[PDB]
Enzyme design. Structure first.
Site, PDB file in Angstrom:
ATOM      1  N   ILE A  16      11.551 -20.201 -27.359  1.00  0.00           N
ATOM      2  CA  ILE A  16      10.473 -19.266 -27.103  1.00  0.00           C
ATOM      3  C   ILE A  16       9.362 -19.426 -28.109  1.00  0.00           C
ATOM      4  CG2 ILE A  16      12.179 -17.693 -26.148  1.00  0.00           C
ATOM      5  CD1 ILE A  16      11.677 -15.928 -28.581  1.00  0.00           C
ATOM      6  N   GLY A  19       6.254 -25.000 -33.673  1.00  0.00           N
ATOM      7  CA  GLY A  19       5.132 -25.336 -34.561  1.00  0.00           C
ATOM      8  C   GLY A  19       5.711 -26.132 -35.717  1.00  0.00           C
ATOM      9  N   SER A  21       7.595 -28.028 -38.509  1.00  0.00           N
ATOM     10  CA  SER A  21       8.951 -28.544 -38.357  1.00  0.00           C
ATOM     11  C   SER A  21       9.860 -27.364 -38.091  1.00  0.00           C
ATOM     12  CB  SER A  21       9.380 -29.280 -39.620  1.00  0.00           C
ATOM     13  OG  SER A  21       8.454 -30.296 -39.952  1.00  0.00           O
ATOM     14  N   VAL A  24      11.480 -21.938 -32.490  1.00  0.00           N
ATOM     15  CA  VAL A  24      11.979 -20.591 -32.352  1.00  0.00           C
ATOM     16  C   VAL A  24      12.706 -20.416 -31.061  1.00  0.00           C
ATOM     17  CG1 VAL A  24      11.482 -18.173 -32.229  1.00  0.00           C
ATOM     18  CG2 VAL A  24       9.980 -19.753 -33.487  1.00  0.00           C
ATOM     19  N   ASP A 132      -5.659 -15.979 -42.728  1.00  0.00           N
ATOM     20  CA  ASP A 132      -5.536 -16.815 -41.513  1.00  0.00           C
ATOM     21  C   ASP A 132      -5.017 -16.051 -40.251  1.00  0.00           C
ATOM     22  OD1 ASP A 132      -6.152 -19.824 -41.227  1.00  0.00           O
ATOM     23  OD2 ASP A 132      -4.437 -19.533 -39.878  1.00  0.00           O
TER      24      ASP A 132
END
Ligand code: 8QZ
Length: 254
Positions: A16, A19, A21, A24, A132
């Protein structure tokens, strides 16, 4: 199609998220309960990176009790090759859902904004500027919004659209107010403030040029229009503080 984290065994249902290494997964524990595991891969991790990850985890774990607008972290196992993190499974990240969603019920969007501030305000209290924030960083759980990460760990989408001008020449809590601003803006006029622009250098110049009128189309919520205008003030000291944003009428008044 099955992992173990501090002995306990989780059965994967699907992937689900992914990104760097890191994958999820959505998974089930022994008692047929649902969780999200973030597997992070460390076999190519330089030292500073390896600290950055230890730090970010340190903090995620810490500011658990300091607020529920931060993704729960139930457990983790960590070794020289991998990290596994057992968090709650959310429904969807904000950014995926904003994409699918037609327009956003004003009450929902204000509710969400309140959580963005609660979350972000917590981390600033602890010294962390996220520096960010994008929609992608927030996860809807039980129609409630939680910060996933603190921007503390290093990387292995480039996106300038949420980036505060004062870091288009290179740290303040005000940087996060800009980004949260762009997130709200997105949630309000369905775009980021400098999206129309396609030349990413024209764009980078747009975000820093006080000659550039940022447009804020008239909408019923004059409460809300104010808050955008207030968050998107190119001078960081001109910009509104988060403790100011929490007493703002938009979030305060019925
Ligand atoms: C994995 C790559 C990554 N790196 N980083 C940076 C730091 O991490 C790497 C370094 O290690 C330190 C650990 O940091 C926590 C981040 C922060 C946003 C990310 N993203 C995530 O961690 C990340 C992204 C999503 N999650 C997480 C963690 C917990 C979680 C729980 N629950 C969910 N729920 C959820 C999320 C998404 C979805 N899908 C996917 C999106 N939708 C689609 O449109 C399908 O297309 C891909 C359908 C809905 C479904 C879900 O529910 C089943 N999602 C996450």
């Amino acid at each position: 199609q099955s992992m173990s984290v501090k002995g306990r065994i989780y059965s994967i249902l699907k992937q689900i998220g992914s990104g760097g290494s890191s994958k999820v997964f959505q998974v089930l524990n022994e008692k047929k309960q649902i969780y999200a595991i973030k597997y992070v891969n460390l076999e190519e991790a330089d030292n500073q990176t390896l600290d950055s990850y230890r730090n970010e985890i340190a903090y995620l774990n810490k500011l658990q009790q300091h607020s529920d607008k931060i993704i729960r972290l139930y457990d983790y196992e960590i070794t020289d090759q991998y990290i596994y993190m057992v968090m709650e499974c959310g429904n969807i990240d904000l950014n995926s859902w904003l994409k699918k969603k037609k327009s956003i019920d004003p009450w929902e969007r204000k509710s969400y904004w309140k959580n963005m501030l609660e979350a972000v305000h917590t981390i600033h209290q602890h010294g962390i500027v996220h520096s960010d924030l994008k929609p992608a960083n927030f996860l809807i759980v039980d129609g409630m919004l939680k910060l996933i990460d603190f921007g503390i760990a290093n990387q292995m989408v480039g996106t300038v659209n949420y980036m505060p001008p004062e870091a288009i020449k290179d740290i303040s809590p005000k940087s996060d107010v800009w980004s949260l601003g762009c997130i709200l803006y997105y949630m309000t006029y369905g775009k980021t403030p400098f999206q129309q622009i396609i030349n990413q250098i024209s764009k980078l110049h747009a975000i820093i040029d006080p000659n550039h009128e940022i447009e804020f189309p008239d909408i019923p919520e004059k409460d809300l229009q104010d808050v955008l205008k207030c968050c998107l003030k190119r001078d960081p000291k001109q910009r509104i503080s988060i403790p100011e944003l929490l007493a703002h009428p938009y979030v305060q008044i019925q």
